[PDB]
């Protein structure tokens, strides 16, 4: 029932830099029963460090652990693309066994502007009496980005479903999908739809739009 507190909760690191994760216990625990796990998206956790400071099998030499008493910590010599993942610490020196919240580590990279695409509803969804306008914003960084929808130049914020991917393992970029769902009813009462994206890679908003007219 020992509460394992981890920090930072999330952090961006530039390649080559040194980073040190922490795990604080509400009460002292045996250094022998403090493990560290690494979990990559869509994969299960894997043992990374056992007994506070022993590297597990397959773990690269740059990783290293240490700590004792009520403070334990994991350290990366020089960050790498693949070291981007979640890291949890575990203690099984007292029942019940408890994990820590985890620390996600994102890999900083060079800024990149999103490639935006817009899509009008399809015949099929229309037949169903519904209309969905979809906008994809691909391969960008940083992750912070704002997206506004404009119907006939007027800004609409209700009925917007946003979803992000994870930092890509190939280029460290992100991708977002924004979806606006309206009634076929409301879709025909307007003519222009615009997906307006505001990212750091520019002062002016990246915009894409179409008109029910021209089709």
């Amino acid at each position: 029932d020992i509460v394992l507190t981890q920090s930072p909760t999330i952090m961006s690191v530039s390649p080559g830099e040194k980073v040190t994760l922490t795990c604080s216990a509400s009460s002292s625990v045996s250094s022998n029963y403090v493990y560290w796990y690494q979990q990559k998206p869509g994969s299960s956790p894997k043992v990374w460090i056992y007994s506070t400071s022993n590297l597990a099998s397959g773990v690269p030499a740059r990783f290293s652990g240490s700590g004792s008493g009520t403070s334990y910590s994991l350290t990366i010599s020089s960050m790498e693309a693949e070291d981007a993942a979640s890291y949890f610490c575990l203690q099984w020196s007292s029942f019940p066994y408890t994990f820590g919240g985890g620390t996600k580590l994102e890999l900083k990279r060079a800024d990149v502007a999103p490639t935006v695409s817009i899509f009008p509803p399809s015949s099929e969804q229309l037949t169903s009496g519904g209309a969905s306008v979809v906008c994809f914003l691909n391969n960008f960084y940083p992750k912070d980005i704002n997206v506004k929808w404009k119907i006939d130049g007027s800004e609409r914020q209700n009925g917007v479903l946003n979803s992000w991917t994870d930092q890509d393992s190939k280029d460290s970029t992100y991708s977002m999908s924004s979806t606006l769902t309206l009634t076929k009813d409301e879709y025909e009462r307007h003519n222009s739809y615009t997906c307006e994206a505001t990212h750091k890679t520019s002062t002016s908003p990246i915009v894409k739009s179409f008109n029910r007219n021209e089709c």
Partner: protein, 216 residues
């Protein structure tokens, strides 16, 4: 060469009972180790539920007592988890695992949703680009799957063929229903000549939809 593999219902209604099965291969439940049941809540919070020792005795997390029961079948070489009176809080990805020292073994994991909401297949819609207005160096198609539940749908472009330049997005739950999408980018010459199809499968309702993206 150890192999673990969870298996279960996928969707169960509140107050009902949960039964998961972990099949171990390449090693005996009796030879050694402690066999654990671990669950990950949406949000990634991890919880140790309990284990069964190779000796057959058990240990349970004090907050799951009275509802939990870990057992096994040495003849089948597999342990089980039984959680009764499940609430929505018990929704998560359930894993079985063992491990000591510089190693461990986990199962791929199994998602279990605890909801009264009814199973609903998906509506799959093609997402072609606007009429005359897309002819750069690369074109971008898409697929939109919506209205389905429970979670877990499988989407592939051209049955695995197309793998590079695709992005599937995490489903979203809006009013007891899931929406999910995926895009695929290819060079302008490829489409619409070469056929580009979007493959979609929803197990919880045994439905397989195939939608080829045709030009507007």
């Amino acid at each position: 060469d150890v192999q673990l593999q969870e298996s279960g219902p996928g969707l169960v209604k509140p107050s009902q009972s949960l039964s998961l099965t972990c099949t171990v291969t390449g090693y005996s439940i009796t030879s050694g180790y402690a066999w654990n049941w671990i669950r990950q809540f949406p949000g990634n919070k991890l919880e140790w539920m309990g284990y069964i020792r190779y000796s057959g005795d058990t240990r349970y997390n004090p907050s799951l007592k009275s509802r939990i029961s870990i057992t096994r079948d040495t003849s089948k070489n597999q342990f089980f988890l039984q959680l009764n009176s499940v609430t929505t809080e018990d929704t998560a990805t359930y894993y079985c695992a063992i491990g000591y020292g510089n190693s461990d073994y986990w199962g791929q994991g199994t998602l279990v949703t605890v909801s009264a909401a009814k199973t609903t297949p998906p509506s799959v819609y093609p997402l072609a680009p606007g009429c005359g207005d897309t002819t750069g160096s690369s074109v971008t198609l898409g697929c939109l799957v919506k209205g389905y539940f429970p979670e877990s749908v499988t989407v592939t472009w051209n049955s695995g063929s197309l793998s590079s330049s695709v992005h599937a997005f995490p489903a979203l739950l809006q009013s007891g229903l899931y929406t999910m999408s995926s895009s695929v980018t290819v060079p302008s010459s490829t489409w619409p000549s070469q056929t580009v199809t979007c493959s979609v499968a929803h197990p919880a309702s045994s439905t397989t939809v195939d939608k080829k993206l045709e030009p507007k």
